[PDB]
Structures are given as structure tokens and as C-alpha cells.
Amino acid sequence: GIKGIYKEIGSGERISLCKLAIDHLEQHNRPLRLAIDMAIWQFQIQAARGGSNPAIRTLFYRFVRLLSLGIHPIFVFDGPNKPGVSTAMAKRLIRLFGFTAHDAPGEAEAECAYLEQQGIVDAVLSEDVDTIMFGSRVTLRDWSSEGGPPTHVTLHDAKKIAEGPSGLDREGMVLVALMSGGGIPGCGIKVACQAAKAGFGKELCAITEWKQRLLHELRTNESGFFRTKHKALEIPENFPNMEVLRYYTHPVVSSPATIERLRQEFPPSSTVDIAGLREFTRETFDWTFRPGAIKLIKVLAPGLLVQRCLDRYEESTLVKGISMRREHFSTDATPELRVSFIPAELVGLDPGQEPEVKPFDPWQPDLAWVPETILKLGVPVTVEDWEEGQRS
DNA sequence: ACCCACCACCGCTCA
DNA sequence: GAGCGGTGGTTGGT
Ligand SMILES: [Mn+2]
Ligand SMILES: [Mn+2]
């Protein structure tokens, strides 16, 4: 649920997460804040195979990707007030990356939408579009390839939907969920959408006046709100159930006090725990000894580089040089510079103090495409010299 | 009596 | 959660 909603509101704009990140950083002069429904992982990460704990290993890699994007994420967990990777390990790993874990009192997607409304986050990444019913304005879904590397997302805009052909707004979709559900039998997304379009989605708190209006409209269709008449659809008395109505209208979410607490404490003083990550990966992935250390260095270095650029907003302690420029399609033509750096020097781990058991040398220069905007923010002098040398 | 377009629903598969 | 074909039902007819 809601089944068939995408044929009504649209499938959504497919867009590079990098583009969303960099555009917001340019438009709003600070990194994008994104609430992530923790329920999204449940079917995406238990598809990885091989090695030790591949499910949380997938989680590790998408966290490194979040670093590379410069996104400030907050992962929201479900609460018990709702009407196989460990939560403990997920939260432990979230802290090691300098990210934020947040426990909803009830359903996470309701909390995520609430956080967005309160200006705690700029957008929501969830299983589906249910977030719109809980007040979300910008909601993201399907963080995946476009495949290979997971670079793109599917963006739904609540205002544009309420204007587009469906005319489905928040209270329209509630009525759809009220009548269709998954409650009137024989109904019915098509009819529910037509009922919503007629404006029956208010529901501004003796409600039986309203109920026998559309009930009259469903069987006679004198206003012509429908393609046909529906004398077969017969409506229960409990309906419209009002517990259900305000499960959407005021879902159980964090207290005002919690909101203002988050408002001062998120984003946190984000810092990646290197030594913490080294122990985690050794314990959980069997990334043991010198090979395991080098493996962590290689994977973590680029994101750690991006992350430290923004955090200052000669310092060649980050970028050793620049050599190219591109507007690749994977980022929807977001200007990137080919950047060099020393992985082990940047991560700050010495593979030597670990036992030894073509290849990759963490002490030699590695290359990475980093968004030009982030580089100008973090290493402005090196970028100007690159621009200077290239007008010759 | 029968056709017909539309639709709601079920079972299916992959996440 | 979300895509597919079947299909049984409803509607408005033919
Ligand atoms: Mn949920
Ligand atoms: Mn949902």
C-alpha cells in the first residue's frame, strides 16, 4: 500500500544523489540533511553474499558512499508505539561513522516526515510514498544503480503532486488510504481518487452528514464525480474509522522537547572514528592483520577526504594535486575534479603495526573524482592553481 | 442473453 | 514494496 499510487501521482523524478547533495550545498550554503527510514535496508542488504556478515558489510559501503556525498544523515529506527542484521550493530556502526541514530516513538516514516516538517532534515529517504501522508514534502525512494554503483534516487515532490493531474494532496491520499486501504470493499483506488478529487478529503472533524453525501454521490453520481455509479459498493458503519483518520492526521511522533533537542544537536560534531572502524571491521568482516588494514584504508580514504573538506567550512594534507575535470552522467553532469591523495596518510593508519600474512600501496598516490564545489570549499588554493595552470 | 471496458483483487516474482 | 497476468465483478450497454 498504496497499491497503484504511482500510476496516479507519477513514478517520480530519477535523479543523482550527488546532484541533490551538491545543488543543496550551493543553494543553501550547508550540507544536505537527510532522514533515512531504517526499514529500507531490510530487503536490499540481505542480497549480498560471501565473506563475514555481508548484510552489514553492504551497510558499511553505503555509509562510505554517504561520506563521499557529504550528506549529514540521520537514521530513524521504529518505536514500539506502532498501531537479519542487528539493530545494536547498525547503531554502533552509525556512531563510528560520525552519523546520527534516532529512535522514533512509533513508525519511523511518520517520524521522518515530522523531522522534515520541523526543518530538522531537508528530505526523507523511505520505502515508499506513505511519508507524504505524514506530512513529507520532498521524499526519496529506491536508492540504487542506474546496473552497478548505487548513484541515483527517485524523488517525489508533494506540492507538484497536488498540482499535477492526480490532485492528490496529503488529505487526498489519506482518503484514498481510508477508502481503498488494503475500509470499503470493492474500493478501489480509481474511485477513491475520484472521491478525493471531488474534495471529500476534508475531514475537518456528527460526521455522518459528509458520509451520506458521497454515499449519495456514489450511487446516483448526479455531480458526476465518477465514471459510473456504484450501488454495489456498500459502506460499513465503523467507516469512516476515526482512529485511522488521525493515525495519519496526528501520528505518534517525538515530543516538542525532543524536536528542539535535535534542533541543537543535529548535525553532530561529525568525526569518523578510524581506530573504532578498524576494530569493527576486524571483528565483523574478518578484515584481519595488514591486509585487513589496507582494505579499510582503500575503501575509507575517498569519503574521509570529502568529509574533511566540508569540515573546514599548507593544507595539501588533503589533496596532493588535480589533473582533470568532468561532467559525468552518473552525477547528472555535476562538475568534478580528478584529485590525488595518499590514502594511508589521509586515513592515519599504519599497516606496519599489523602482522604481515600489481597490488595496492596505501602510501602511493590514489585518484578520486570529487565534486568541484566541495573542493572549492575545502581546498580553494589548490583549485585556483589548477584553474590557473589550465588557462595557459 | 451476451458482450464490453474498466477495475479490484489475488498470486506471482524480486527486492 | 512494487511490478506483472489472470480473473471474477461491476457497469453500461448491445
Ligand atoms: Mn515503516
Ligand atoms: Mn509504507
Residue numbers in the entry: 2 to 84, 97 to 159, 163 to 198, 204 to 226, 235 to 342, 357 to 400, 431 to 465
From the paper:
GEN1 is a member of a superfamily of structure-selective nucleases (Grasby et al., 2012). We have now solved a crystal structure of active GEN1 from C. thermophilum bound to the DNA resulting as the product of cleavage.
Metal ions are bound in the middle of this cluster of acidic side chains. For the original Mg2+ crystals, a single bound ion (M2) was observed, but after soaking the crystals with MnCl2, two bound metal ions were observed. (B) After exposure of the crystal to Mn2+ ions, two bound metal ions are observed. These are coordinated to the six carboxylate side chains and the terminal phosphate group (P5′). Metal ion M2 is 2.1 Å from the carboxylate groups of D141 and D143, while M1 is 2.2 Å from the carboxylate group of E122, 4.1 Å from that of D38 and D79, and 4.7 Å from E120. It is also very probable that the metal ions have moved from their positions prior to the cleavage reaction.
